[PDB]
Amino acid sequence: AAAHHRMRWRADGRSLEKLPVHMGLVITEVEQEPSFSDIASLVVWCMAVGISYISVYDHQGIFKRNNSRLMDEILKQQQDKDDQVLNCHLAVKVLSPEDGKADIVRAAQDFCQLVAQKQKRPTDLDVDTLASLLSSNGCPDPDLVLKFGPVDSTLGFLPWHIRLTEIVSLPSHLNISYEDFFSALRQYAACEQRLGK
Amino acid sequence: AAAHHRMRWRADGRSLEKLPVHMGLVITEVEQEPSFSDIASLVVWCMAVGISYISVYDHQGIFKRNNSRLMDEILKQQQDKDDQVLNCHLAVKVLSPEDGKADIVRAAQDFCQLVAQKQKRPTDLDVDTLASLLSSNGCPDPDLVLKFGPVDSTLGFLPWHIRLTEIVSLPSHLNISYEDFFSALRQYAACEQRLGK
Amino acid sequence: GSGMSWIKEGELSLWERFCANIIKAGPMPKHIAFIMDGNRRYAKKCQVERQEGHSQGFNKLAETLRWCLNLGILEVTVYAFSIENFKRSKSEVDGLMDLARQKFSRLMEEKEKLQKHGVCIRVLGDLHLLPLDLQELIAQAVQATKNYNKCFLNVCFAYTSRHEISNAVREMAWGVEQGLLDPSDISESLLDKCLYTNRSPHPDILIRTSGEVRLSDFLLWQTSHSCLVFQPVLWPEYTFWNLFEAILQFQMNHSVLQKARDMYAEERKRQQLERDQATVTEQLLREGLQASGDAQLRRTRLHKLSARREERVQGFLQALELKRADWLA
Amino acid sequence: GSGMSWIKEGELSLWERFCANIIKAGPMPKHIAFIMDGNRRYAKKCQVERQEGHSQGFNKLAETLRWCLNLGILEVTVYAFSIENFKRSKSEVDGLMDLARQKFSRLMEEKEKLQKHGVCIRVLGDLHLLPLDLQELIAQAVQATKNYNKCFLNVCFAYTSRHEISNAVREMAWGVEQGLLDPSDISESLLDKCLYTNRSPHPDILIRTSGEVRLSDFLLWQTSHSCLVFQPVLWPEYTFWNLFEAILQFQMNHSVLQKARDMYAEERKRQQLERDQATVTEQLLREGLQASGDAQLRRTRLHKLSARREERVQGFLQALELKRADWLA
Ligand SMILES: CC(C)=CCC/C(C)=C/CC/C(C)=C/COP(=O)(O)OP(=O)(O)O
Ligand SMILES: CC(C)=CCC/C(C)=C/CC/C(C)=C/COP(=O)(O)OP(=O)(O)O
Ligand SMILES: [Mg+2]
Ligand SMILES: [Mg+2]
């Protein structure tokens, strides 16, 4: 039955016109503490349907300050344990506001220091090289952001990285269903990016 | 005339039944910023009449945060310059509250650390050894404190060190005269310490 | 002054005026940013040629700017041409360049009318990618309407946000190279003043028309805490009521968004203070000094660290402004 | 309960009662400390024998304690016998020991009367230097009147401040040796709770009679911010009005002394916070972690550093109190 569930989720992801390589989960709801079991379900659903990377984000840093409780919940819902832990660590990133603007600033400090050390010229800094300095260096930008809650804002989520990201909004993550999550994927799959053309 | 002034101050100090080896100047007046020229005069008077050490103190740390302006004023009123500077540094200490209780605490930390390192036993700490740890280690305790201003308190001035100190009070240091200063010395010279007997 | 061509408008109708007075009792946006999307779909919908859609889209910009003024919203930013749009067909790109040549150039001829109403026109982008003549028309309009205060239109042309952010870093890098900056001076606040939009507060609202739910490399830094409104309407069909709906969305978000914006700023300042205290501590345990003295050495060194930083920044900004003002055309 | 012998008193006269009501409208001291000086000079003045001066001096202590109670001043500390006084002649030292044997011992016999009025008697000093029998009488009186709340007399006997301070450090050193303390836990606050006087707030007033203007190794730590009053009167001649004058001196100093006391305490806490932040910073740059993270690592480590310190202190104090309570006699 475990192999049956895996096959269904794989068929589901494979059936869509396209799947996000990298999905962001933005939790805006502040009235209630976030539900870690619901977030973990979303993350496991992404992995099960074929999405490579999932970033979990809240403007207050709640997830970043409860990283271990979130991983434990994610690992629990999947059911060598070391291999599963390493896999979750490679796929899941737990972000907070400092991962956006404050990290662009960190990259600019690093570059300016290289200018100060006569290693680089100001004209060396272009868009590509700025992205190389950006702490998300080896990772693809988020294709899809699922925003939960009533705030119509990205609330500081990876400003540099969401230049082309599709933003689908859901009212709440609190008792999220697989159908609600897959509906969002269907919406993303139907998007057409013309890239300026 | 310079040699004449020196001889007069020496005769003045030598005429008293006794002179303090170490005098403390406690400035309690907070309505006006302390007058550095008046403090410097007092210090020069002490040195001129034969007192070895002078501690300058105010509860706000004003003198400690304006150490260079006070030395400069003291050096000015005396009139090799290096020798005079070294002499003032050996005779004058500029103190603040941290030099009292906070320094007894520092000594107790140092001793307890030696206990922690199995170098000393709690019974090793007696009165003499506590004084050895006390940052005033090589210096004699103040014989006389001149307190200026309207506050009837030592305001945290060297609590451990004033166990036997004579405390003479003057209303203000603001335009202090040599006669007013010498009157205090005459009062100290007339004191009899029976040391418990 | 009747009406300029960038452009003038009539007063609000009775119903529009009434609703305006109602929402003006609550928080109002000071700055709205528009992604003007859907011109071509609108042309296909109305059986008109693509150039007619873009020209109608310009008319709607002039109409929408009038609505904003009639609502007391005195600063507007619009996405008129992305660097990515250079990938479109020469026939369409030329049609857009010719429109810009025609709408600019009409800005002049309508001078004095812009000066009579204090209309500041700013054009933001990597403008060296535009035809030279269009650049000179742009520069004249920007130079003419500088020092105007009553309202502000920012036309993002040959613009992307990533190009803007990397230019802001380049400007700070130049500052370091020139000796006007130390690398440790770089900050979110300083980067903000190096953006093309540095004379504007961040948008209160970001509106994108047509059904697209993405930012498309527009004001990514500036809109991190902005109310985002995605409306299905095609841009040339924009109405006062679409604008009204967006303002309504902003008012419903405003209390949460304000608190989050304020909490973010307090947390950044808190962490900046922690970082500066740690710097002062490291410099102090290097050497033999202490950190908890009555001399308040830490506090004096913390004040000098921050004052020298602010002095160096003010000097860099002034030099940046002098370089930016320096222009043949 | 009429009157004990340590001792009871009549009510205030009309003039004393009137002046009391006047000064009770302003700040009143909660704790007064007396250096009872001038007994021998008084004996020579009255052509009485030295032992009669000391016995009269005890009578004045009982009278002065009654005045304090009638004024609502419920805690008094007195310098009855200094360690240095052991240097006096055997005839005088024995006379003082016999007085103490007689005034104690009369504390018992007057039990129940002490319990009826809630009189707590504490005796502070290096009491192992006293004759064994006097120690046992002292211990009985202290043990009997413990758990009493209405008023407090602290009799400093075979006491010096330097011996008290070094004992407080010894107690903290024992704490470190026992594993109840870390050396970094030592603090001004902790040292305070290791003094003989740790069940008493610091004196509001320190009074010394006769013309002597020195502290003579009495409550040096405790009186660093106390109003100091030196009165020429000989101790056996102390009157209500000398006490009144001293309280008046305290009221005139009170606003400055309070602010200075408060400014000192805020500055100590400020510097303690700076020191703890620097500790957390050093531990953080050791290892690879950072200090300005959204994870608030610095803030979690700062809270744990201070909570573990407070937990270790509370455990040490409880063990110190258990050791101090442990007494055959
Ligand atoms: C300063 C000036 C004269 C500016 C020109 C006026 C103006 C409104 C320009 C915007 C042109 C544009 C790229 C619209 C985007 O919709 P689209 O073309 O992508 O339409 P679609 O999404 O339906 O294909
Ligand atoms: C608990 C108890 C029974 C205590 C005894 C009562 C009592 C008042 C003791 C104080 C004795 C003493 C050393 C007085 C100091 O004046 P002094 O002797 O130094 O007189 P002088 O300065 O004039 O020489
Ligand atoms: Mg479009
Ligand atoms: Mg005496």
Residue numbers in the entry:
A (entry chain B), B (entry chain B): 79 to 157, 176 to 293
C (entry chain A), D (entry chain A): -2 to 326
Q: Can I see the authors' text?
A:
The human cis-prenyltransferase (hcis-PT) complex catalyzes the formation of dehydrodolichyl diphosphate (DHDD, C85–100), a long-chain isoprenoid, by chain elongation of farnesyl diphosphate (FPP, C15) via multiple condensations with IPP. DHDD is the precursor for dolichol-phosphate, the lipidic glycosyl carrier crucial for N-linked protein glycosylation. Localized to the endoplasmic reticulum, hcis-PT is composed of two structurally and functionally distinct subunit types. These include the catalytically active DHDD synthase (DHDDS) and the quiescent Nogo-B receptor (NgBR) subunits.
Indeed, this construct (termed hereafter xcis-PT) resulted in well-diffracting crystals while demonstrating unperturbed catalytic activity, allowing us to determine its structure in complex with Mg2+ and FPP at 2.3 Å resolution. The asymmetric unit (ASU) contains a single heterodimer, with Mg2+–FPP and an additional phosphate moiety bound only at the DHDDS active-site. Moreover, it reveals the structural organization of the DHDDS C-terminal domain, exhibiting a “helix-turn-helix” motif fold not observed in other cis-prenyltransferases, which facilitates complex tetramerization via a dimer-of-heterodimers assembly mode. Importantly, this tetramer is formed by both homotypic interactions between DHDDS “helix-turn-helix” motifs and heterotypic interactions of the “turn” region with sNgBR from adjacent ASUs, burying a total surface area of 793.3 Å2. The active-site contains two substrate-binding sites: an S1 site, which binds the initiatory substrate FPP, and an S2 site, which binds the IPP molecules used for chain elongation, and is occupied by the phosphate molecule in our structure. At the S1 site, the pyrophosphate moiety of FPP interacts with a Mg2+ ion. This Mg2+ ion, which plays a crucial role in pyrophosphate hydrolysis during the condensation reaction, is octahedrally coordinated by two of the pyrophosphate oxygens, three surrounding water molecules, and one carboxylate oxygen of the strictly conserved D34. In addition to the interaction with the Mg2+ ion, the pyrophosphate moiety is also directly stabilized by R37 and R38 from helix α1, and R85 from the βB–α3 linker. While xcis-PT was crystallized in the absence of IPP, a phosphate molecule occupying the IPP pyrophosphate group position, as observed in other cis-prenyltransferases, is present at the S2 site and is stabilized through a concerted coordination by the conserved R205, R211, and S213. Specifically, strands βΑ, βΒ, and βD and helices α1 and α6 are tightly packed via hydrophobic interactions, leaving this region without a detectable substrate-binding cavity and completely devoid of water molecules.
